[PDB]
Amino acid sequence: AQTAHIVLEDGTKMKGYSFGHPSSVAGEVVFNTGLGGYPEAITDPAYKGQILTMANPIIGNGGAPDTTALDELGLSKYLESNGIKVSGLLVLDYSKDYNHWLATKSLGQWLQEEKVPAIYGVDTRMLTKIIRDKGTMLGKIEFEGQPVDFVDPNKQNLIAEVSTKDVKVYGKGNPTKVVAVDCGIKNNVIRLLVKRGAEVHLVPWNHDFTKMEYDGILIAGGPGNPALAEPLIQNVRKILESDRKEPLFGISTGNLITGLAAGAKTYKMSMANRGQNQPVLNITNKQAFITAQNHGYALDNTLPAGWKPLFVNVNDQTNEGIMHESKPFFAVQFHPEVTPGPIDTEYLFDSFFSLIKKGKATTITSVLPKPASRVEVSKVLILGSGGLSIGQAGEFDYSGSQAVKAMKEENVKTVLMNPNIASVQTNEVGLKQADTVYFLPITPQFVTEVIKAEQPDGLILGMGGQTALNCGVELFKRGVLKEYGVKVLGTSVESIMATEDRQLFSDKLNEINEKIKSVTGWKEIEYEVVRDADDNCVTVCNMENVDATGDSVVVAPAQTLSNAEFQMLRRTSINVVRHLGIVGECNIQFALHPTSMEYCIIEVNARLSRSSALASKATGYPLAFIAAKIALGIPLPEIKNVVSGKTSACFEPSLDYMVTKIPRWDLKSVGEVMAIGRTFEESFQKALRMCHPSIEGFTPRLPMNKEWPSNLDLRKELSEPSSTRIYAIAKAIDDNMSLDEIEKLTYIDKWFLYKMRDILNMEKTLKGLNSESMTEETLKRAKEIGFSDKQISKCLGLTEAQTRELRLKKNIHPWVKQIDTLAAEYPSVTNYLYVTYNGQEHDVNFDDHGMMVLGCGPYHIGSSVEFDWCAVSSIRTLRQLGKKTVVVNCNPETVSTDFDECDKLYFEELSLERILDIYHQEACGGCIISVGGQIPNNLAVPLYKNGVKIMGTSPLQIDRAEDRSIFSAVLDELKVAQAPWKAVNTLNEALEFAKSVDYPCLLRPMNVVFSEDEMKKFLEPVVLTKFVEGAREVEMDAVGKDGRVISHAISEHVEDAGVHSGDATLMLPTQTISQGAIEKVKDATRKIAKAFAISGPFNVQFLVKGNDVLVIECNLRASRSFPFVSKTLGVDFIDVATKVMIGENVDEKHLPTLDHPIIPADYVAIKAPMFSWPRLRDADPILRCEMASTGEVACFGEGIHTAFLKAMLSTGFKIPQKGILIGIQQSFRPRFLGVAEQLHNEGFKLFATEATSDWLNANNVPATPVAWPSQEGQNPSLSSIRKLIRDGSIDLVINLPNNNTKFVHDNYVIRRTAVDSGIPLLTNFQVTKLFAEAVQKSRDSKSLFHYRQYSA
Ligand code: NI
């Protein structure tokens, strides 16, 4: 593998691998931040004599096009000149394998044919930072045995070198004669002239054209110092001084030449302008445009008499164009022909031809638009995250806090609605805290009441998800917003409705020739677009789905598009967004045909979404904040880019890294991860690891250590989207199925599959090696494509720890880099970071020595938004005590990953390897593992053995408390009772245990076991426990200090113990627990805290039956109920815990200690899941139907009954008042008849399947019979459930657990129907009793929340 160095004149050397022509070359080293269009870019004549450093880390994906083909004009069909014009090329990663429908060969082959040197494996970000702001950096690509000297190609006249040597004519026969002066013109200039009716006479740079006949003249170019082109400058000067009045249009070099000819000065810029995201402002009318630029010389801003500036650079104030005051002469410094780059300024060609066609010495101003007073807002109502919408069920969006922040900076008063009293959104005490908060449901009724009370003049309805949008739209339609004088801020409701209705949407798009059948196998691309009130419009992020709504593997930026495809879609995005009148943020999704330019629009979303959140996290561009400012009528150029500080929101980010997002499935998605790397492979393997700790990376092995079935149909597994498809792909490759076949079956673009094949080949290479034979080079490469020490250890036969030691002995370690939004074009002081093996330096200093706080990882069942609240509180406590903080998390749906709230944010893996990397590189003073759920807590001991100082409760004690055997022996000694239990190995040991304590029994890897047969199936180390029947469950949440409980709260589950404890509804304080049991609970907690020397948060769960109290388990960390308990009691338990763990003294006088609890007297609090849905055990271990749930709603009420009803309304349900479907197991009839009568006596009409209806009627409780879903149409007499739910006859379903395998399917269907129709579903008897009691006591709805003040 042949190597070479890039060597700069300042001494910098980087070693890389040759992929072009293997010979040395010297030139000016430059960088360009444009991501797309490398084939077009490297044929730009402006690069003559230059060694080009690419910002885009991943280069070569589309190979090289047909480089010999000509179009009808005799120009290169696919390129911008007749060959590669760069002197050399520097890239981070070169794709050897390419895949694109226009590709004819690899980029390397093309570079070899053209004799151009190129190396990969160099840190292009570091190069960019070195080159930046130093006028001319000279360098060379040097091969061993081929030494060269530094040379500056700008000292020769490069214009002359690239110019045509003879006159050439394009568009022969066309009616408008245009002379084009070739100073290194790009082909697209000619294409655009000819398309507009020009016969183009392309003349040499030094051709005396001054006496030629022509209708118009254009001067275009790229390379070199324009001052060396004196003969051309002289000739242009003769035109300027003659009586000739033909329009003159200068492009880039043309701006410099025209300016020089007129008497202006040029200089070499210390910071060149080279990218596709260069914002310019039209000085006359203030319109902004994104442009492509590639120039290193500029015009002095002091112009001679008769000339005026036309465009200015928004970032650096340099001239971007000029015009004559009265004659049709003008020029621009940027390239409106782009290729590559944004098609935003092509209208300048139209302008040119208009000047020619009119032809009475008009000015440029008169053939461009003229200049145009904004919305005045004193108080704004922001609709926060709310309850259920049909289809968008379980969605949450806390971006309203960024809106609050934006409004505050503009001195606008804020009112926020969010019904959850323990929401992270309302756990804010600074700039993100609303002036007034209403804890009311996001529904039209309640929103109307807040409007009456507060009289806001503005409403924000697009930052609280679907429910908030629907609520706002509904209020508009009813005339409520008009009646109270409330302006919808941002995109109007008319426009929103057009995006929400498919027909209206189709109609609107047809007015601009865009349209909308099967598009499976098409590439799915999305763009995030921002548009301000003044019609400025930028694309902030683009994304490509890897596989085949929002449950895909996604990468950003898109990887497999050409410039032409990317810019065509971008352009359409911008047109659609303008035509719809978007004022704010917008998401647009496209399907693109994989082997042509055909596309269509799938949808547009005019509210903040998952995509907009992903885009902000991926880019560092704060969409929600900016959208809120835009809603006040502030234009993009008047808003600051908070990452660079020095520039504005009016730009398109360039990324010098790649992002991978992967859904987290329940082991249909429950959460997501995002990883950052500088190869696809690094990003991708990281993201896979982030999903679950049992996933090693990209391998042919399944999560959770499961083995593949023996009857596996691999082709079938590939052709069906599922949560394990990625592992199946790895298997298919490993079993030597061709990539073409895999592509056919999966629709995954082959480019991604080549990367996946490369990972598997590295695994094979590693398996043949050992700790003595593996070279530095191979290990380096493995780490650069995302291999963990764990993966490597398995291949080499070592432990993880030995592998880490081996790697550090070779001094192979990762590097900390900033996400700066600009690919280092400008220095950033951002503290938003990631870690990569693909680099040669760190972007920050390591002098803070801060306190590390570990986040929770992806959300999933049992691990939700509650840990986000805990992180926020802990981080804030540290900051308020003046402690520096380092936060680590990889969950892009979290609020706590806010780089403004901590001093360093690492958006990184929560593995032992990566946490050690960060901790030791920062030399942190400590690490808090207690506030991020299970992930961080399981790392306690490993971290401790690797030099990490864990704060609070010792890791040795955590290990003891969570080892079941040791924990259980400690309880015995303390005389604290527990549920009898056993660890079993043999199936027979299970029967022996079950025998000695009776069925049913519980199982942990939590599932119930009714019979011995059922036990037999489950083993396809396992713990068995007996729970008592009819027990209550109680949670103890507490904070210990030196083994003493200094804060505690006891909550009672509504549900009897047994049905999973993590979706249980909690009541605080307790409702039906005896006083003696409470005392025993306290006493057991006292002893437990002392036995494990607790300093920090902890949780203990108990079974209570009468006076019997049994410990179930102890978690030596904060639990999901810490926020609930804190808000209910008026004391932040995390703040107390964080203080204890870092040794900050705390006053116990007013805390809820065991001796003096805090027990609310005037109110009760309830915590319930936000969303619940049924799941069928179709996997076939047992046939059963369970509920799963996620999210949180917490409310206060005078008692638990009114709290419960408030929680039902807060989740977005209507309190039932018409009819109830009753489904119960036959054996449960005697126990249910009482509640059935009670519901009926409240006026509910009862419905049930036939046998149950007959049973009710025979017991004098009236009931109407209905059909089992599987038996509909077998009896016309009986009505269908679906129909009765649709007519509104049934507005509540009770469906209690049912073991009868005959009706498990129907019961699942019934449950699914209730959920899909948005009506409350009760699946537990105690909950059902609570509901029946509550409707008895209650009335209407507004009365429950009636401005009650809750405290103490
Ligand atoms: Ni410029």
Curated annotation (Swiss-Prot):
Phenotypic consequence of residue 725 to C: In CPS1D; moderate decrease in protein yield and partial loss of enzyme activity
Effect of substituting residue 499 to M: In CPS1D; almost complete loss of enzyme activity; approximately 60-fold increase in the apparent Km for bicarbonate and approximately 4-fold respective decrease and increase in the apparent Vmax and Km for ammonia
Segments for region (Anthranilate phosphoribosyltransferase homolog): 1-176
Consequence recorded when altering residue 1236 to T: In CPS1D; significant reduction in thermal stability
Effect of mutating residue 132 to W: In CPS1D; uncertain significance
Residue span, Glutamine amidotransferase type-1 domain: 177-362
Mutagenesis or variant effect for residue 348 to R: In CPS1D; significant loss of protein stability
Cellular compartments annotated: Mitochondrion; Nucleus, Nucleolus; Cell membrane
Modified residues (Phosphoserine): 106, 492, 495, 710, 771, 773, 911, 954, 965, 968, 1061, 1277, 1289
Glycosylation sites: 492, 1189-1190
Oligomer and partners: Can form homooligomers (monomers as predominant form and dimers).
Disease annotated for this entry: Carbamoyl phosphate synthetase 1 deficiency: An autosomal recessive disorder of the urea cycle causing hyperammonemia. It can present as a devastating metabolic disease dominated by severe hyperammonemia in neonates or as a more insidious late-onset condition, generally manifesting as life-threatening hyperammonemic crises under catabolic situations. Clinical features include protein intolerance, intermittent ataxia, seizures, lethargy, developmental delay and intellectual disability.
HAMAP family for the chain: CPSase_S_chain
Domain topic, free-text comment: The type-1 glutamine amidotransferase domain is defective.
Protein name in the entry: Carbamoyl-phosphate synthase [ammonia], mitochondrial
